[PDB]
């Protein structure tokens, strides 16, 4: 009867506490810290609260005066719990879908908002990213709405260099072409590049400068080394050819 | 009876696990990575949880003490699940409607917020865009609200060039007209352009400069090459005609 | 009985698939692309899911063990669908109301947020706008909260020109008046203008300049040509009268 | 019986279509455009959908297999409709309350966010504002959260003028006082002003300037003309008295 | 019976229209404008709609075919009305609570976000604030989340003056002290101040300047006059003592 | 019966009005202003509305035609009231939790967003903060999401001083060390400091300067006086040692 | 009967007040302040309100006129309470999940938004962080959405130094290499570093400068000391080698 059902609740409560002891062993893993005492206390309190609620519900059902006040209170508490748990299920679903489309793997370079780093590990609710300063960022999946991946597909560079307006375009463009040529005859750099450079010439005009563009396409994650080498060669050849940097201009009175 | 219904639940649970094995084969595709072990474990856990919930519901219905506590808990969990799944159905509906109006195809150049690139593939929940730096962006449909497409219809250029205030408009405007004339007699460039240039003359006055505007209408995705050629010719002809760039001015004491 | 009702469900399912084939013909229109295969598959899957849900509901109703678990799951799914469809009905209602008040027509120049262009077509959920760069923007109605229309009513110009503080106001104001006078005696420009210019004189003082204002009222969409002509004439007459542009000033030690 | 009720539904459907024809005449007004064909088609489709839903509901009620699937679908659709209609009733209530407190009339100058213009007309959902560039802005009431009105009450000006630090305050303040004095003896300007000027003297110190403040109180919508006249007189009297504008200062080495 | 109840509905509808006529007299007050015709029409339409809904509900209840479609539609409409009325009850509650704590009175100087002005009147939903330019701002209570009041308690000034780095602190600090001394011996200003000045000396170092701080505590709303007088005296005494303003510095080559 | 219950409602209504008279005495306190007449009228109107609603509900229950229209209207009104009261209960809970953790006391210096001041009093819904300009800010608890407290624990200073690149680090660092030494031998300042200074040397390099860092740890709320004294001593010793401030540099042609 | 149940409610109310007295002892702890009188009064008021609500509910259930008005009011109050408690359960769940993944411990350096500091203590709803200025920040868990931890894993430095464009890269790069060499031969600094420096050479070109990059990997929380030492050595060796800082350039007329 009611007493037999009440004993079943107590038996299940002990099993949940025994399951909490199993969770203590799981929590006992060195990876998730060693201060699991607080977490265990919360689980025990929750189990006790659930057992007390079940017992009170049984008593009220056997009372005959309707559980309406207490039932309404429990319903309000459950509604609050459901309202507060939107974000968690949001992270779970978002992460499940992200791994479904092979959006993120471990070790690749990504960009989530204002952060760029390498993925270290993915939990059920968040993803760990290691920044170039050594900081470890924990980003929940629902916080992620748009991200970029640098290992998928191919890589490319687009380089723009500003040249002073007073000079002529033919000499500066030839200097840039020569700088790219010296880069091409280098062996491992040319191994990184895939194909031939794309010279665009003047791509803009300013009040004191004009800009020249040259674009490549390289191996994934190799664009930055090529960019740095190109910058060094461009500086060297601009110095050789006498190309001037943009200079401010003014008049007096 | 209850036992026969319980056996049916177990039979369906095995079928779902067999369906999960079929999903494992689907997940086994090289495109969606190779670490599908985690996804399979989640599906198995979900199937086990569903089977346990069904069995407990049957037992409680056959108990006679009302499923009210457990039923309310299940209802709260379902409410949380429904609340957390708003974004997913939002992406699904938004993508379905976007493909309905032929808003986006594969390979075209688009602009979604601060990102400009070529569409590579569209999933049920997101769209992949390839940037000019080689990064691969995953953008969910609900995150997309307003976007532009450069392949629909036509293309056009509007070019504004700043000339300092001290010179006269007739000489600078004539120099710009001559620069456009040299561009027109070029053959492939004229093939890109559709029609005749639209000279607007002075379109603004600054404290140290005035601006001249000339606009074209070209083939789709061909506006940038025409713009670069026009910039080069404008610089050359401005140098030829002696037109000066804007210069700062000050007085002493 | 139940079997007769089940046969009716199957008959309706085939009719929906036949209706999907009718939608395939509608989707077959060249305007909405040619890759309608994906859309048809989704419709077929939805019809199959609906038929299966109806059959399972009938079986459960004829079972006698209550549909409560499955009914609650279906209710949660429907709640999620309703929650995710807020935006779509929002666009539908907003567009219906916008067309009710004659807010937007096709071909007129509008400004929706940071975008200015001519309306090309309006769907049930969005509106297409053509920018001056040739890009085609798709803007849903709910994303629209405030917009401006340049074809309703009239057009006007308010022109402010900065003159440096050192000169006198009477000479510069007279030069501006003469510049407007030359503009007035032109024939087509005066045809664009409706009425007489409104001279306001000095309307502000800066540390190194003062500003003069003149305003007109012209035909719709004709304000920019008048503004450009006024700017050219103002520059010419300021050069003629010897009016100086604002100049920076400093002192040494 | 059921057939008699079904005939009543058909009779009401025709009346709604006849009411749509009456709405067509209302829509036929030249003010709300002439392309009301699309709106009429939507109304006809909605009436047909409502009639079909009513007929299906009657058939299902007379079937005996419960309307539960279809009733739940209709409930979900109604929930989505109610969720998507929050903004519309928000505009209706906000506008009703705004006209209740006499916040806005037709023809007055207002400022709603970043827009300043004269109210032209108010609908049930929006308000039309005419900008000084001739653009016509449609602003829904719910989008309005805070606005200012320039015709209610009185008007005032607060004028701050920057004077170089190196000069003395007594001479510059006397020059400003004389400039206000000349303004006062003018007749229509003095008619605009209500009372006497309020001289505050130095109200701030900068690294290269100090500022003098004088404030008035004038008729509504007349503050700007008084401000412009005061600016012109202040410039003239500052030139007469030899008061210098703020000047940058530096030292070498 | 049903007819007797229907007659009661009609009798109440006329009473509501008579109550609307009473509201017309209330609306007839000159303060809430004179165009109350539109408001009366809306009230009459609402009363007619309510009467029609009640009659249709009675007819449907006496029909026997369940009001379920129409009842569900009415429930959806009521849900939309409740959803759209969140802001109004929010303003009502916020204003009621604000007047409970004596946060705002009429005539005092407040600062609500980017607006500073004097409270003119408070409605049930908003508050009117008069700006120093004469504009009248209507701010709903829910839009208010944080505001400041200048009449509660006391007033104070904190004055920071920048002196160039090259000079010595003792001379400049003594000059500031003397400037405060001249202010103190003035009688009405000293009546405004409550106590003695608080000299803090150097409170910061810049690349080309250092700043000195002096703070007071005065009567409410009297801080600005004291600040202006202090600024004037500080300028005068800095000129007397030969204290220099911050000056830019550079070097050549 | 119904009449006896109706008399009970009237008796309770009078008691609520008598309770409102008790609230009038409470509102009669000089602290919560003296214009409590408006609040009392609102309470009386609410009591009358509640009594009328109860009477109408009783009449409808005794009518037999279902309260469904009026009951649904009351339910919608209650739903709107509950929706609009989210913020109030949010403030109540947030404040209760804030006082639970001893986050804020009265008189301490706090920083809530862009505001820094001393707490004056805490209500059930908001907290009053006194700014250094004398303004009194009212901040609801829900508006508070993150704040800092300067009285808990200790205080510290981190001082960075910029020295131009041209000079040598050893001389400037020695000058800073000597400046700190003179500060240390002062007696009350050394009483404020707790321990020894932490010299960090160069902590950054700019194009025209390098920065030196020295950090302390002092008593709570005493960091600013120590900072000002350190700034004065640093300026004095930099002047003594001939250390130069950062200076701009350029080249000609 | 009803009286026996009413006595049980009174007995439980006293037990709750006795439990409040136990909470008073808990609140009596010196850590959570000493003004717990206000909190106790709120608990007593809540207990009294709950007891009164239970008694009124029992009386209404024994009345026979339905609790519908009062039950609906209680339901609306509970709905408001549930709506206002979303944030609290959000913090609880977020903190529980954060501690689960070992995201934060006590004493480590973290970065939560614009705040960087050391964790001092974690409550159930918030986390205390000590800033370098001595301020104590209280941050709820729901307010936390993304944070970084500096003690997990390893630490690294990336140093960029700008060199004037006019000089040559080989000399400046050699000077930087020598500066790193002197740093390496230092003993405790080399103990901090883990491995060898990574020289990247030129990594960017500006209009007046080029930048050189060198990166390390050091012990956790030791990156800043290494960075400061590297900056000092780089300045010293740049001075030794005659490397110039970036300099502005202009031309006259």
PDB file of C-alpha atoms in Angstrom, chain G residues 16-155:
ATOM      1  CA  UNK G  16       9.349  27.123   9.763  1.00  0.00           C
ATOM      2  CA  UNK G  17       9.762  30.063  12.149  1.00  0.00           C
ATOM      3  CA  UNK G  18      11.947  27.834  14.330  1.00  0.00           C
ATOM      4  CA  UNK G  19      13.827  26.904  11.153  1.00  0.00           C
ATOM      5  CA  UNK G  20      14.151  30.642  10.503  1.00  0.00           C
ATOM      6  CA  UNK G  21      15.679  30.965  13.977  1.00  0.00           C
ATOM      7  CA  UNK G  22      18.149  28.263  12.939  1.00  0.00           C
ATOM      8  CA  UNK G  23      18.822  30.305   9.797  1.00  0.00           C
ATOM      9  CA  UNK G  24      19.340  33.316  12.077  1.00  0.00           C
ATOM     10  CA  UNK G  25      22.163  31.409  13.787  1.00  0.00           C
ATOM     11  CA  UNK G  26      23.552  30.569  10.338  1.00  0.00           C
ATOM     12  CA  UNK G  27      23.110  34.207   9.316  1.00  0.00           C
ATOM     13  CA  UNK G  28      24.669  35.080  12.673  1.00  0.00           C
ATOM     14  CA  UNK G  29      28.073  34.086  11.326  1.00  0.00           C
ATOM     15  CA  UNK G  30      30.446  37.097  11.288  1.00  0.00           C
ATOM     16  CA  UNK G  31      31.311  36.483   7.627  1.00  0.00           C
ATOM     17  CA  UNK G  32      27.780  37.323   6.330  1.00  0.00           C
ATOM     18  CA  UNK G  33      27.628  40.676   8.161  1.00  0.00           C
ATOM     19  CA  UNK G  34      25.644  41.305  11.356  1.00  0.00           C
ATOM     20  CA  UNK G  35      22.499  43.068  10.044  1.00  0.00           C
ATOM     21  CA  UNK G  36      20.528  39.845   9.500  1.00  0.00           C
ATOM     22  CA  UNK G  37      17.462  41.395  11.141  1.00  0.00           C
ATOM     23  CA  UNK G  38      16.062  42.506   7.778  1.00  0.00           C
ATOM     24  CA  UNK G  39      16.497  39.034   6.265  1.00  0.00           C
ATOM     25  CA  UNK G  40      14.776  37.385   9.237  1.00  0.00           C
ATOM     26  CA  UNK G  41      11.805  39.749   8.932  1.00  0.00           C
ATOM     27  CA  UNK G  42      11.406  38.839   5.257  1.00  0.00           C
ATOM     28  CA  UNK G  43      11.470  35.121   6.094  1.00  0.00           C
ATOM     29  CA  UNK G  44       8.870  35.616   8.830  1.00  0.00           C
ATOM     30  CA  UNK G  45       6.647  37.597   6.453  1.00  0.00           C
ATOM     31  CA  UNK G  46       6.975  34.891   3.796  1.00  0.00           C
ATOM     32  CA  UNK G  47       6.091  32.160   6.301  1.00  0.00           C
ATOM     33  CA  UNK G  48       3.065  34.140   7.489  1.00  0.00           C
ATOM     34  CA  UNK G  49       1.938  34.719   3.893  1.00  0.00           C
ATOM     35  CA  UNK G  50       2.295  31.012   3.096  1.00  0.00           C
ATOM     36  CA  UNK G  51       0.322  30.034   6.208  1.00  0.00           C
ATOM     37  CA  UNK G  52      -2.426  32.538   5.390  1.00  0.00           C
ATOM     38  CA  UNK G  53      -2.595  31.307   1.788  1.00  0.00           C
ATOM     39  CA  UNK G  54      -2.883  27.686   2.941  1.00  0.00           C
ATOM     40  CA  UNK G  55      -5.617  28.552   5.448  1.00  0.00           C
ATOM     41  CA  UNK G  56      -7.557  30.569   2.865  1.00  0.00           C
ATOM     42  CA  UNK G  57      -7.210  27.731   0.346  1.00  0.00           C
ATOM     43  CA  UNK G  58      -8.583  25.236   2.874  1.00  0.00           C
ATOM     44  CA  UNK G  59     -11.473  27.563   3.749  1.00  0.00           C
ATOM     45  CA  UNK G  60     -12.307  28.089   0.071  1.00  0.00           C
ATOM     46  CA  UNK G  61     -12.150  24.343  -0.637  1.00  0.00           C
ATOM     47  CA  UNK G  62     -14.570  23.818   2.266  1.00  0.00           C
ATOM     48  CA  UNK G  63     -16.747  26.698   1.012  1.00  0.00           C
ATOM     49  CA  UNK G  64     -18.030  25.140  -2.223  1.00  0.00           C
ATOM     50  CA  UNK G  65     -18.005  28.286  -4.394  1.00  0.00           C
ATOM     51  CA  UNK G  66     -14.785  27.269  -6.230  1.00  0.00           C
ATOM     52  CA  UNK G  67     -11.345  28.736  -5.502  1.00  0.00           C
ATOM     53  CA  UNK G  68     -11.202  29.849  -9.152  1.00  0.00           C
ATOM     54  CA  UNK G  69     -10.576  33.615  -8.592  1.00  0.00           C
ATOM     55  CA  UNK G  70      -8.111  33.115  -5.746  1.00  0.00           C
ATOM     56  CA  UNK G  71      -6.619  30.017  -7.390  1.00  0.00           C
ATOM     57  CA  UNK G  72      -6.085  31.983 -10.612  1.00  0.00           C
ATOM     58  CA  UNK G  73      -4.462  34.808  -8.657  1.00  0.00           C
ATOM     59  CA  UNK G  74      -2.137  32.353  -6.923  1.00  0.00           C
ATOM     60  CA  UNK G  75      -1.313  30.780 -10.283  1.00  0.00           C
ATOM     61  CA  UNK G  76      -0.477  34.178 -11.763  1.00  0.00           C
ATOM     62  CA  UNK G  77       1.747  34.970  -8.775  1.00  0.00           C
ATOM     63  CA  UNK G  78       3.519  31.630  -9.157  1.00  0.00           C
ATOM     64  CA  UNK G  79       3.978  32.228 -12.881  1.00  0.00           C
ATOM     65  CA  UNK G  80       5.542  35.616 -12.139  1.00  0.00           C
ATOM     66  CA  UNK G  81       7.831  34.029  -9.534  1.00  0.00           C
ATOM     67  CA  UNK G  82       8.914  31.344 -12.008  1.00  0.00           C
ATOM     68  CA  UNK G  83       9.504  33.941 -14.732  1.00  0.00           C
ATOM     69  CA  UNK G  84      11.628  36.093 -12.429  1.00  0.00           C
ATOM     70  CA  UNK G  85      13.759  33.170 -11.220  1.00  0.00           C
ATOM     71  CA  UNK G  86      15.259  32.252 -14.612  1.00  0.00           C
ATOM     72  CA  UNK G  87      18.539  34.035 -13.916  1.00  0.00           C
ATOM     73  CA  UNK G  88      19.139  32.390 -10.530  1.00  0.00           C
ATOM     74  CA  UNK G  89      18.774  28.805 -11.745  1.00  0.00           C
ATOM     75  CA  UNK G  90      20.838  29.853 -14.765  1.00  0.00           C
ATOM     76  CA  UNK G  91      23.721  30.871 -12.488  1.00  0.00           C
ATOM     77  CA  UNK G  92      23.357  27.680 -10.452  1.00  0.00           C
ATOM     78  CA  UNK G  93      23.495  25.395 -13.497  1.00  0.00           C
ATOM     79  CA  UNK G  94      26.295  27.374 -15.154  1.00  0.00           C
ATOM     80  CA  UNK G  95      28.462  27.275 -12.036  1.00  0.00           C
ATOM     81  CA  UNK G  96      27.789  23.573 -11.504  1.00  0.00           C
ATOM     82  CA  UNK G  97      28.857  22.843 -15.079  1.00  0.00           C
ATOM     83  CA  UNK G  98      31.905  25.127 -14.848  1.00  0.00           C
ATOM     84  CA  UNK G  99      33.189  23.321 -11.757  1.00  0.00           C
ATOM     85  CA  UNK G 100      32.473  19.988 -13.476  1.00  0.00           C
ATOM     86  CA  UNK G 101      35.012  20.634 -16.254  1.00  0.00           C
ATOM     87  CA  UNK G 102      37.639  22.065 -13.852  1.00  0.00           C
ATOM     88  CA  UNK G 103      37.313  25.395 -15.638  1.00  0.00           C
ATOM     89  CA  UNK G 104      38.151  27.508 -12.592  1.00  0.00           C
ATOM     90  CA  UNK G 105      39.998  26.915  -9.330  1.00  0.00           C
ATOM     91  CA  UNK G 106      40.810  29.253  -6.426  1.00  0.00           C
ATOM     92  CA  UNK G 107      43.823  31.542  -6.760  1.00  0.00           C
ATOM     93  CA  UNK G 108      44.348  31.216 -10.510  1.00  0.00           C
ATOM     94  CA  UNK G 109      44.503  34.159 -12.907  1.00  0.00           C
ATOM     95  CA  UNK G 110      41.435  34.423 -15.153  1.00  0.00           C
ATOM     96  CA  UNK G 111      39.936  36.887 -17.630  1.00  0.00           C
ATOM     97  CA  UNK G 112      36.147  37.300 -17.615  1.00  0.00           C
ATOM     98  CA  UNK G 113      35.248  39.914 -20.206  1.00  0.00           C
ATOM     99  CA  UNK G 114      37.040  43.193 -19.489  1.00  0.00           C
ATOM    100  CA  UNK G 115      38.282  42.004 -16.069  1.00  0.00           C
ATOM    101  CA  UNK G 116      41.553  40.219 -15.273  1.00  0.00           C
ATOM    102  CA  UNK G 117      42.271  38.988 -11.772  1.00  0.00           C
ATOM    103  CA  UNK G 118      42.722  36.091  -9.376  1.00  0.00           C
ATOM    104  CA  UNK G 119      39.778  33.995  -8.210  1.00  0.00           C
ATOM    105  CA  UNK G 120      39.215  34.396  -4.466  1.00  0.00           C
ATOM    106  CA  UNK G 121      36.067  32.374  -3.731  1.00  0.00           C
ATOM    107  CA  UNK G 122      33.142  30.801  -5.580  1.00  0.00           C
ATOM    108  CA  UNK G 123      29.613  30.913  -4.198  1.00  0.00           C
ATOM    109  CA  UNK G 124      26.612  28.989  -5.518  1.00  0.00           C
ATOM    110  CA  UNK G 125      25.520  31.967  -7.642  1.00  0.00           C
ATOM    111  CA  UNK G 126      28.651  34.080  -8.217  1.00  0.00           C
ATOM    112  CA  UNK G 127      32.454  34.101  -8.180  1.00  0.00           C
ATOM    113  CA  UNK G 128      34.697  36.644  -6.464  1.00  0.00           C
ATOM    114  CA  UNK G 129      37.681  38.008  -8.382  1.00  0.00           C
ATOM    115  CA  UNK G 130      40.395  40.271  -6.959  1.00  0.00           C
ATOM    116  CA  UNK G 131      41.664  42.917  -9.368  1.00  0.00           C
ATOM    117  CA  UNK G 132      45.175  44.361  -9.373  1.00  0.00           C
ATOM    118  CA  UNK G 133      43.741  47.617  -7.957  1.00  0.00           C
ATOM    119  CA  UNK G 134      42.398  45.804  -4.891  1.00  0.00           C
ATOM    120  CA  UNK G 135      38.770  45.959  -6.024  1.00  0.00           C
ATOM    121  CA  UNK G 136      36.653  42.875  -5.320  1.00  0.00           C
ATOM    122  CA  UNK G 137      34.336  41.898  -8.179  1.00  0.00           C
ATOM    123  CA  UNK G 138      31.250  39.706  -7.777  1.00  0.00           C
ATOM    124  CA  UNK G 139      30.366  37.981 -11.053  1.00  0.00           C
ATOM    125  CA  UNK G 140      27.312  35.701 -11.369  1.00  0.00           C
ATOM    126  CA  UNK G 141      27.742  32.538 -13.394  1.00  0.00           C
ATOM    127  CA  UNK G 142      25.078  33.398 -15.979  1.00  0.00           C
ATOM    128  CA  UNK G 143      26.864  36.688 -16.653  1.00  0.00           C
ATOM    129  CA  UNK G 144      29.902  34.548 -17.524  1.00  0.00           C
ATOM    130  CA  UNK G 145      29.756  33.240 -21.095  1.00  0.00           C
ATOM    131  CA  UNK G 146      33.450  33.013 -22.049  1.00  0.00           C
ATOM    132  CA  UNK G 147      36.581  33.170 -19.902  1.00  0.00           C
ATOM    133  CA  UNK G 148      40.288  32.381 -20.144  1.00  0.00           C
ATOM    134  CA  UNK G 149      42.570  30.673 -17.629  1.00  0.00           C
ATOM    135  CA  UNK G 150      46.301  31.357 -17.474  1.00  0.00           C
ATOM    136  CA  UNK G 151      47.348  28.472 -15.206  1.00  0.00           C
ATOM    137  CA  UNK G 152      46.098  25.627 -17.414  1.00  0.00           C
ATOM    138  CA  UNK G 153      48.774  24.239 -19.702  1.00  0.00           C
ATOM    139  CA  UNK G 154      51.746  26.349 -20.741  1.00  0.00           C
ATOM    140  CA  UNK G 155      52.582  30.018 -21.291  1.00  0.00           C
TER     141      UNK G 155
END
